[PDB]
Paper text:
As the main entry gate of mitochondria, the [name] complex is responsible for transferring ~90% of mitochondrial proteins from the cytosol into the mitochondria. Mitochondrial proteins are primarily synthesized within the cytosolic ribosome and subsequently transferred to specific mitochondrial compartments through the corresponding translocase complexes, including the translocase of the outer mitochondrial membrane ([name]) and the translocase of the inner mitochondrial membrane ([name]). The [name] complex consisted of two [name] pores, which were surrounded by two copies of three small [name] subunits and tethered by two [name] molecules. To investigate the transfer process of preproteins from cytosol to the mitochondrial matrix, we captured the [name]–[name] supercomplex by translocating Jac1sfGFP to isolated yeast mitochondria to obtain [name]–[name]–Jac1sfGFP supercomplex.
After the [name]–[name]–Jac1sfGFP supercomplex was purified from a 100-L culture of [name], we further obtained a density map (overall resolution of 4.4 Å) of this supercomplex through cryo-electronic microscopy (cryo-EM) analysis. In the architecture of the [name]–[name]–Jac1sfGFP supercomplex, the structural features of the [name] complex were significantly clearer than those of the [name] complex. Further analysis revealed that the local resolution of the [name] complex structure ranged from 3.0 Å to 6.0 Å. The densities corresponding to Jac1 polypeptides and sfGFP were observed within the [name] channel and on the cytosolic side of the [name], respectively. The rough densities of the Jac1 polypeptides were mainly distributed close to the cytosolic side of β-strands 10–12 within [name] channel, and the remaining densities along β-strands 3–10. Moreover, structural analysis of the Jac1sfGFP-engaged [name] complex revealed two preproteins proximity sites (PPS) on the mitochondrial surface. The PPS1 corresponded to the N-terminus of [name] (residues 1–26), while the PPS2 encompassed the loop between β-strands 14 and 15 of [name]. The PPS1 and PPS2 were situated on the cytosolic side of the [name] complex, potentially functioning in recognizing the incoming preproteins. The PPS1 was close to the β-strands 9–11 of the [name]. Superposition analysis of the free [name] complex and Jac1sfGFP-engaged [name] complex showed that [name] exhibited an ~3-Å movement towards the [name] channel in the Jac1sfGFP-engaged [name] complex, suggesting that the [name] might respond to the incoming substrates.
Numbering used by the authors:
A (entry chain M), H (entry chain E): 19 to 60
B (entry chain L), I (entry chain D): 27 to 61
C (entry chain J), J (entry chain B): 86 to 135
D (entry chain I), F (entry chain A): 49 to 276, 295 to 373
E (entry chain K), G (entry chain C): 13 to 49
Write the structure that this text describes.
């Protein structure tokens, strides 16, 4: 089901590409829990 | 006695031009606080 | 009679105008008061620095 | 070509920014809401503009229960992604080939409705700016266009006045011939930039005339009027009181409704906000309050935010 | 029937093109008017 | 009657003040409201109490559009009159024959509904409390009472616990024989006055149990139990954060609703107040805002108000 | 028919009065209990 | 009929007697306009 | 599995007992600010 | 499957508890910080006078 496999990528995979974009350019590069956490606990 | 769409458009335009005169007048500047 | 009609008209217009004026002004009152409070404390800080 | 340069004109803003002051900057229609609203936006870096936002809201039909968004903006490229509960993916990309020529596309997944997307190619010259936008094109089997097209031109005839026009062609299906929408633009600028006027005539018979002013460095106001046989018109006066600590906006309407919105910053990161509109032709009110946390992503920006 | 509507759309588009040409030509016209006055 | 004094019993609180601090000082139900409200009260005299009030409200069922109220209170007598838009007149008069014996009358005219008025006569003793209330008294042509009467008793069995009862009689028309209702009342107080419990059993079978603790001079917390074949119950808990500059109140409910009510005294003369609540089991909210100007009548009291 | 309910209410009120008398007496019997303690 | 005569006048006139009591006790005894005025213009 | 008025009354009583235990415990006492 | 049910339940309860916490806390936080600021200013005036 490659056709719908590409379909699921558009929804779930768009934001993490942006997230991966920022995390790549972050000088800190924390872990996924810290990225998704709205807390400033760093 | 008209009570027409022309009446309501005329009153809207009169209100607009009155507001324009008010905003141009230095009375608004007086309303504007010095600070 | 006409007196009661005029009284009701005056009361209604007074109520609506008062409500609009207060809800326009109280936020202005508090905001300008806070800003001028900041201004005066900043002036006092300048004076104590100098 | 030489005397054209000798005229010494300037580049006007875009049509979307034609009414920027009176519509967006001064008034509150863009910013107003109803009910409780909580916002959690935070930036991990500044020079590469990158931040993510959390939005909690209840009581307003337009705003969802919870939505999450993120955005990035480098020197020439801007990106923004947004997600909502029910998984309505929203994303927009803005890339600039040059400081004058910018390509940008908007995306919005509905997940239950046909997804709509708009693409905009924006170019500006020394004296005019051109935009072309479309909404869900489609090519018929004959090679003929089917969709909605948006394109406008705007040129400053004199350094204080500019005139513009927009062309809108919408081909819904191709069975019915497409219709055309032509609108006229008029913008005037004070020599001292004290006051700005803007007036437009839409293809739908709707005329929007707006006047803006800058009373001083901290005080400004504006007036606008709209209109639409069946003809209906409205007028709204308002003023924005900007300050270093709090921001006020007020509004009076010809339709007998009043509104006020107040952004009050209490901390460098805490920003409480209030808004409420009150109608009188039917004696009802709408009230909304909220706040915004803004936090840094790293210790350096965390220290910088406090100073 | 629809042919008349299509021709109306065509002439509207041609009018828009003429307006664009006129507005691009306009600044020199107004400059020379100011020179006259 | 000698050992009566030798047992040094203390004066119990009045029945209406049984759960006074829980239902009123701790919780917010009587204080809470919805929509925009404004309170404009001014005072002219203090040694004989004398002040008036203007109240402007909108977006609430209980609060009228505008109502005016004036109250007077001398050393022993209290008077209060209230007028509402639609000409609703209500008034309360307190005339104490002595410190222990007080006469009270409540008047309220609806002008379109039968005028409801209640008569209250209470006497307070050194070890027990008693009071009688009647509602709309009327004697039939045979000399028989027709209406509603309320009488309650409360006795200090010990300086720590006070148990009492209330007896009510209601004859609506006289054709139907009046019914009698007896409810049990119980109150206990900590030996060090830190925590207070209050439990009652209504004649209707409903059980109301309330409790409180004075955690500190700036914090209180209280929990109540209420329940009512057809048996239904509720559970609400909450705390109050009182302070010199402002006081907050908020509660938690078994019915899945939360509450907030904070009055913000920004000026010695001006107090802003904010309230709101959520209904999680219904996913709906209620929000209200308010402010209060209290102003002296004469220059001397204005100076005292300012300092 | 309603007479029986009427004297039932009378019984309830006289029981309430008796309970009032008992609770008035109660401080003294509590004092006696404390003496017993 | 006397209670009916009381019905109309007492409804309107209850507050006037309340303010007549207060106005007597006032040290200033200002005019009716100042009594009815919420403004502190004194 | 009851789903009964006795069930909900027992739940309410459990809430009452939990609340009174919590308040009598030093839990809110340490929750109570020193200021 | 059960994973989706658990995720939806967790998200709903998390959102509910978060909104309850913010609504119960923000007025308290602003009030206590305001009063603490007032304590700071009064103690600064006290030490300046002394």
């Amino acid at each position: 089901k490659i056709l719908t496999l590409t379909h699921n990528v558009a929804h779930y995979g768009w934001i993490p590409f942006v997230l991966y974009l920022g995390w790549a350019h972050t000088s800190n590069r924390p872990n996924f829990l810290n990225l998704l956490s709205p807390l400033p606990s760093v | 006695f008209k009570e027409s769409p022309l009446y309501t458009i005329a009153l809207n335009g009169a209100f607009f031009v009155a507001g324009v005169a008010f905003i141009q007048s230095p009375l608004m500047d007086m309303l504007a606080p010095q600070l | 009679s006409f007196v009661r009609n005029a009284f009701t008209k005056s009361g209604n217009l007074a109520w609506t105008l008062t409500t609009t004026a207060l809800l326009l002004g109280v936020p202005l009152s508090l905001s300008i008061l806070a800003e001028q409070q900041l201004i005066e404390m900043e002036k006092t800080f300048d004076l104590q620095s100098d | 070509h030489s005397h054209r340069q000798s005229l010494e004109l300037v580049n006007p803003g875009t049509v979307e920014n034609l009414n920027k002051e009176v519509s967006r900057d001064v008034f509150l229609s863009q910013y107003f809401f109803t009910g409780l609203r909580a916002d959690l936006n935070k930036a991990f870096s500044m020079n590469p503009a990158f931040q993510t936002s959390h939005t909690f809201s209840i009581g307003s039909q337009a705003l969802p229960k919870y939505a999450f968004s993120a955005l990035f903006a480098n020197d020439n490229l801007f990106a923004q992604g947004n997600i909502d509960n029910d998984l309505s993916v929203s994303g927009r990309l803005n890339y600039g080939w040059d400081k004058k020529n910018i390509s940008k596309v908007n995306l919005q997944i509905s997940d239950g409705q046909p997804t709509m997307c708009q693409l905009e190619q924006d170019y500006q010259a020394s004296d005019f700016s051109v935009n072309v936008k479309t909404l869900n094109p489609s090519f018929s089997e004959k090679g003929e266009f089917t969709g909605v097209a948006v394109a406008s031109f705007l040129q400053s005839v004199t350094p204080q006045l500019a005139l513009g026009l927009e062309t809108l062609y919408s081909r819904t299906d191709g069975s019915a011939p497409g219709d055309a929408g032509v609108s006229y633009l008029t913008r005037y600028v004070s020599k001292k930039q004290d006051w700005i006027f803007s007036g437009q005539l839409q293809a739908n018979g709707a005329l929007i005339a707006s006047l803006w002013r800058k009373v001083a460095q901290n005080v400004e106001a504006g007036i606008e009027t709209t209109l639409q046989p069946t003809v209906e018109g409205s007028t709204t006066i308002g003023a924005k009181y900007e300050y270093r600590q709090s921001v006020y906006r007020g509004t009076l309407d010809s339709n007998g409704k009043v509104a006020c919105f107040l952004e009050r910053k209490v901390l460098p990161t805490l920003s409480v906000l209030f808004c409420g509109e009150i109608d009188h032709f039917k004696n009802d009110t709408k009230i909304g309050c909220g706040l915004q946390f803004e936090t840094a992503g790293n210790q350096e920006l965390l220290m910088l935010q406090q100073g | 029937e629809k042919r008349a509507h299509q021709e109306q759309t065509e002439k509207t588009l041609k009018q828009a093109a003429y307006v664009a040409a006129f507005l691009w030509v306009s600044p020199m016209i107004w400059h020379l008017v100011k020179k006259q006055w």
